[PDB]
RNA sequence: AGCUUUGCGCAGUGGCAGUAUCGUAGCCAAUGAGGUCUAUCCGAGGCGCGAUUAUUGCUAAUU
RNA sequence: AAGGUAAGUAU
């Protein structure tokens, strides 16, 4: 009740502290794994003869 | 104290070198971007209810919710008490 | 729940459905005091800004505005219905009732996905869209 | 009946016994091949 | 008289990368921006916001 | 008892 009308008006607005990158990040592209992974996986199955 | 303008060739008093250079190299792309921004924020319809409508809705909620508000406690949906 | 716009008579609901030509008119039928409606309205409030490009959300009290109770079978604590260009867009949620969402959701992304699917299907000119998620079960384990 | 997964997993105790026997056999074969200055072939370590 | 250095333009050829390029009548900044290493030493932009197919145009198809 | 409705345009 004792909050004056000036105090009521002087209430600040809430501003976000996160920057542009945090709030609205650019779309994160998804890419396939490099072919070296398949190459090394198929090389893993290879075994010596001695 | 007149210094020749490197961008226009005219003479400006030295009290206005930095401001003249900053304004002189101002991209019109800034002007069109600002005009676009002004057009966007002055044409989007408000999504949330106005303040008086929020207050009226909260008053109706308090009237119909006596398990939270009021003195006497009626059922969850009833308004008599 | 109280931050959303409210419609106070059937004519207002009709005008809100008629006014929007390029956005889905999401209207929640229920009571601001019902806990299920409180949950649904909180979910709708969390997404109201996000979907404002292709959806508008209104709340209607079925006691203050009983003009659609018999028509739309609004005899559930909470009900969410979708309209696009003066046409009620049904959705195949897998619940057996394809006309409305009669429960309260908990995921904002769920409701956003449903709104987006309704928007796309209605833009293509379809009266029924298939929900990306089935609701024949609550997936509780 | 569809096969049960247990019938095709060798128990730990039998597998440890087999490991001991197999590695003793491999040690014997390796020592034999050293005497011939020969490298163990895949066919030598076939039953193992 | 040739030769040659630096900076600025204007073009030509060629190479490389599109998780990046810009915009700043927003703010701060050699009266010091920003400092994990080298600190009685380093020395230049930083931040916020906005644009976008992580620069933008035409052209050709399908439409 | 349900979670099993195509959305239609014509007659």
Nucleotide nearest to B40 (CA to C1'): E50
Domain-embedded: residue C56: yes
Element (H, E) at C81: strand C78-83
List Cβ neighbours of C98 (8 Å cut-off, separation of 6 or more). C90, C91, C92, C128
Q: CA of B19 and C1' of E45: distance in angstroms?
A: 18
Token pair listed for B63: 């009237």
Q: Cβ contacts (< 8 Å) between A48 and chain D: which residues?
A: 42
As a residue count, chain B comes to 81
Domain-embedded: residue C98: yes
Which residue from C25, C56, C29, C24 is spatially nearest to C40, judged by alpha carbons? C29
List Cβ neighbours of A48 (8 Å cut-off, separation of 6 or more). D42
Preferred mutation among B40, B48, B53, B73 to probe C, highest tally of C CBs within 10 A: B48
Taking CB atoms and an 8 Å limit, are C35 and B65 in contact across chains?
no
List Cβ neighbours of B15 (8 Å cut-off, separation of 6 or more). B1
Domain-embedded: residue C101: yes
> Please, what sign has the CA dihedral across residues C16, C19, C21, C23?
negative
C3 in Cβ contact with C45 (< 8 Å): yes
Please give the Cα distance from C47 to B74 (Å, whole number).
33
- Resolution rounded to one decimal, in angstroms: 3.1
Please give the Cα distance from B59 to B79 (Å, whole number).
12
List Cβ neighbours of C99 (8 Å cut-off, separation of 6 or more). C72, C73, C81, C88, C90
As a residue count, chain D comes to 48
Domain-embedded: residue C141: no
To the nearest whole Å, the CA of C77 is away from the closest chain B CA by 11
Task: Search chain C and give the residue with CA nearest B77.
Answer: C33
Q: Can you give the three-state secondary structure of C85-141, one letter per residue?
A: CCCECEEECCCCCCCCECCCCCCHHHHHHHHHHHHHHHHHCCCEEECCCCCCCCCCC
Taking CB atoms and an 8 Å limit, are D41 and A47 in contact across chains?
no
> Please, what sign has the CA dihedral across residues A14, A17, A19, A23?
negative
Taking CB atoms and an 8 Å limit, are D40 and A50 in contact across chains?
yes
- Give C26's strand partners: C57, C82
Domain-embedded: residue C96: yes
Within 7 Å of a protein beta carbon, the nucleotides of strand F are: 2-8
Torsion angles phi and psi, residue C59, rounded to 5:
-120, 135
> Please, what sign has the CA dihedral across residues C77, C83, C137, C95?
positive
Does any strand F atom come closer than 7 Å to the Cβ of C99? yes
Chains B and A touch (3+ CB pairs under 8 A): no
Which residue from C127, C122, C129 is spatially nearest to C54, judged by alpha carbons? C122
What would you measure as the largest C-alpha separation in chain B, in angstroms?
84
Which residue from C2, C9, C17, C19 is spatially nearest to C61, judged by alpha carbons? C9
DSSP, res C55: E
Please give the Cα distance from B61 to C112 (Å, whole number).
26
Please give the Cα distance from C138 to D9 (Å, whole number).
37
Burial class (CB in 10 A: 0-12, 13-18, 19+), D35: exposed
**Residue position matching structure tokens 């002004």:** B38
C50 in Cβ contact with A24 (< 8 Å): no
Taking CB atoms and an 8 Å limit, are C4 and B48 in contact across chains?
yes
Domain-embedded: residue C52: yes
- Give C128's strand partners: C90
Label residues C12-31 b or e (16+ Cβ within 10 Å = b): ebeebbeebeebbbbbbbbb
| Long-range own/partner contacts, residues A23-28 (CB < 8 A, 24 or more apart) | none
To the nearest whole Å, the CA of B69 is away from the closest chain C CA by 12
Domain-embedded: residue C72: yes
Residue C107 belongs to domain with CATH number: 3.40.30.10
Token pair listed for A17: 């502290």
Please give the Cα distance from C94 to C114 (Å, whole number).
13
Domain-embedded: residue C73: yes
Range of the domain at C15: 2-136
Please give the Cα distance from B62 to C32 (Å, whole number).
10
Please give the Cα distance from D10 to D7 (Å, whole number).
8
Q: Indicate which technique resolved this structure.
A: cryo-EM
Token pair listed for D26: 């491999």
Q: Give how many domains chain C has, as a whole number.
A: 1
Please give the Cα distance from D12 to D10 (Å, whole number).
7
Kindly report which amino acid residue has its CA closest to the C1' atom of nucleotide F6.
Answer: C128
Nucleotide nearest to C137 (CA to C1'): F3
Label residues B43-67 b or e (16+ Cβ within 10 Å = b): eeeebbbeeeeeeebeebbeebbbe
Please give the Cα distance from A10 to D3 (Å, whole number).
77
SS3 label, residue C7: strand
Q: Cβ contacts (< 8 Å) between A50 and chain D: which residues?
A: 39-42
Token pair listed for C68: 């659609």
Q: CA of B27 and C1' of E43: distance in angstroms?
A: 30
Please give the Cα distance from D27 to D38 (Å, whole number).
14
Element (H, E) at C82: strand C78-83
Nucleotide nearest to C125 (CA to C1'): F7
List Cβ neighbours of A11 (8 Å cut-off, separation of 6 or more). none
- Give B13's strand partners: B2
SS3 label, residue A18: coil
């Amino acid at each position: 009740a004792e909050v004056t009308e000036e105090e009521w008006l002087s209430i600040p607005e809430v501003g976000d502290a996160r920057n542009k990158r945090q709030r609205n990040p650019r779309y994160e592209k998804l890419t396939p794994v490099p072919d070296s992974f398949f190459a090394k996986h198929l090389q893993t199955g290879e075994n010596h003869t001695s | 104290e007149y210094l020749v303008s490197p961008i226009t060739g005219e003479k400006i008093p030295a009290s206005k070198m930095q401001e003249h250079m900053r304004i002189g190299l101002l991209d019109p792309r800034w002007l069109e971007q600002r005009d676009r921004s002004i057009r966007e924020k002055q044409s989007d319809d408000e999504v949330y209810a106005p303040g008086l409508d929020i207050e009226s809705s909260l008053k109706q909620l308090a009237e119909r919710r006596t398990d939270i508000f009021g003195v006497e406690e009626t059922a969850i949906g009833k308004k008599i008490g | 729940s109280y931050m959303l716009p409210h419609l106070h008579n059937g004519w207002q609901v009709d005008q809100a459905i008629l006014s929007e030509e390029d956005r889905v008119v999401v209207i929640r039928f229920g009571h601001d005091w019902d806990p299920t409606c409180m949950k649904m309205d909180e979910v709708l409030y969390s997404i109201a800004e996000k979907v404002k490009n292709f959806a508008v959300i209104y709340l209607v009290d079925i006691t203050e505005v009983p003009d659609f109770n018999k028509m739309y079978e609004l005899y559930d604590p909470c009900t969410v219905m979708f309209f696009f260009r003066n046409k009620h867009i049904m959705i195949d949620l897998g619940t057996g009732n394809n006309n409305k969402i009669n429960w309260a959701m908990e995921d904002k992304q769920e409701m956003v996905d449903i709104i987006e699917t309704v928007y796309r299907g209605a833009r293509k000119g379809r009266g029924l869209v298939v929900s990306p998620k089935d609701y024949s079960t609550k997936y509780r384990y | 009946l569809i096969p049960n997964l247990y019938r095709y997993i060798q128990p730990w105790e039998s597998e440890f016994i087999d490991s001991q026997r197999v590695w003793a056999e491999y040690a014997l074969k390796r020592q034999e091949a050293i005497a011939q200055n020969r490298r163990l072939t895949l066919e030598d370590l076939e039953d193992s």
